[PDB]
Design a binder for this molecule. Structure first.
Ligand SMILES: Nc1ncnc2c1ncn2[C@@H]1O[C@H](COP(=O)(O)OC(=O)CCCC[C@@H]2CCSS2)[C@@H](O)[C@H]1O
Ligand SMILES: [Mg+2]
Length: 337
């Protein structure tokens, strides 16, 4: 058989992306794979994105929404169980993302929805208010294979989608790919019945129809670690701060705050999630600990826990500025979250 059909029972984007990556690396040359999956509360960003610029990382952290960086290109999307994902993989030179797009459009047609491709990566439906995006796609290719993965909005919480994709206003000068915002809708507005299982079946049937074969589905469960080469290491990396946050392209952040005890402005340059240069400007009446902080920050992780550690470490040699340092510490954490 040339097909493989894989259905995930995990709702963890890190698990599901690691499965996708290991399956993809190990895929025989002649195989075509369909992988069908969902993620609970997640924002997934493209390989070259800056999370702090592209989504509300602070709100996500408060609400236990997971950040996942994927290996494909493109922008930032929100997943909950009302969102369904597909991945189609194939070897080159056969691989062509147009084929899998047409398979999804055929599945939607079979369910009674008329959609069409829009721009490079969207599927859109017509509504009384104008065209709405129900799907976003992204792609990855190597010398000898490709995959096309994308979403379908069935019954996603669109108020949460907006919330986590509306970042705090920050002075970030950031390299990387920026998201392209659209107006979206749920398929449930067109088909009130519609379920994840129904959509998975329709996509499955259209995949089988296109290729002229059927195969038995294989279920992948987080209850048994998948016996895929390098799974443990891939999963650990996919889960890590260093991958999801630290892989952001080089950027600068200009942070500033007025305190009762004076103004502080900080300029961080960040590369690979570390502060490679920090500069402090202040009119505090006791600037010494702030000057000490500026030198000590070089090499520090751009992350609240480590920044607060550096602020608070100054209490030993600057105990008279405890009030200032604790205010600075709490502010700075909130400013980089
Ligand atoms: N879940 C989802 N589905 C469709 N569109 C969405 C979704 N979430 C947000 N959006 C809208 O798309 C834009 C961003 O569009 P943009 O074109 O910038 O990015 C994409 O579409 C990326 C698709 C990635 C698909 C992968 C599938 C497996 S893991 S995630 C966002 O600002 C909203 O307007
Ligand atoms: Mg868009």
């Amino acid at each position: 058989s040339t097909l493989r059909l894989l259905i995930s029972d995990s709702y963890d984007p890190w698990f599901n992306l690691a499965v996708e990556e290991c399956i993809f690396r190990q895929m025989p040359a002649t195989q075509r794979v369909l992988f069908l999956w969902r993620n609970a509360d997640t924002v997934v960003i493209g390989r070259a994105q800056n999370p702090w610029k592209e989504c509300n990382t602070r709100r996500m952290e408060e609400d236990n929404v997971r950040l996942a960086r994927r290996s494909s290109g493109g922008g930032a999307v929100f997943h909950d169980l009302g969102n369904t994902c597909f991945t189609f993989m194939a070897g080159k030179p056969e691989y062509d993302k147009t084929i899998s797009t047409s398979i999804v459009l055929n599945a939607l047609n079979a369910l009674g929805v008329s959609a069409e491709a829009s721009g490079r990566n969207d599927l859109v439906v017509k509504t009384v208010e104008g065209d709405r995006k129900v799907s976003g796609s992204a792609y990855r290719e190597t010398k000898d294979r490709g995959f096309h993965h994308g979403t379908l909005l069935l019954n996603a919480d669109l108020s949460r989608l907006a919330n986590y994709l509306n970042p705090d206003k920050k002075k970030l000068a950031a390299k990387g790919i920026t998201s392209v915002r659209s107006r979206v809708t749920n398929l449930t507005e067109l088909l009130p019945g519609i379920t994840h299982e129904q959509v998975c079946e329709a996509i499955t049937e259209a995949f089988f129809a296109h290729y002229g074969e059927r195969v038995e589905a294989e279920i992948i469960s987080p209850n048994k670690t998948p016996d895929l080469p390098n799974f443990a290491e891939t999963f650990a990396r996919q889960s890590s701060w260093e991958w999801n946050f630290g892989q952001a392209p080089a950027f600068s952040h200009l942070l500033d705050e007025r305190f009762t005890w004076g103004g502080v402005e900080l300029h961080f340059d960040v590369e690979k999630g570390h502060i490679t240069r920090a500069q402090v400007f202040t009119d505090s009446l006791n600037p010494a600990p702030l000057e000490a902080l500026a030198g000590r920050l070089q090499g520090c992780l751009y992350r609240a826990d480590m920044l607060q550690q550096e602020c608070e470490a100054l209490l030993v040699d600057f105990p008279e500025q405890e009030k200032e340092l604790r205010e600075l510490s709490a502010w700075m954490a909130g400013a980089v979250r």
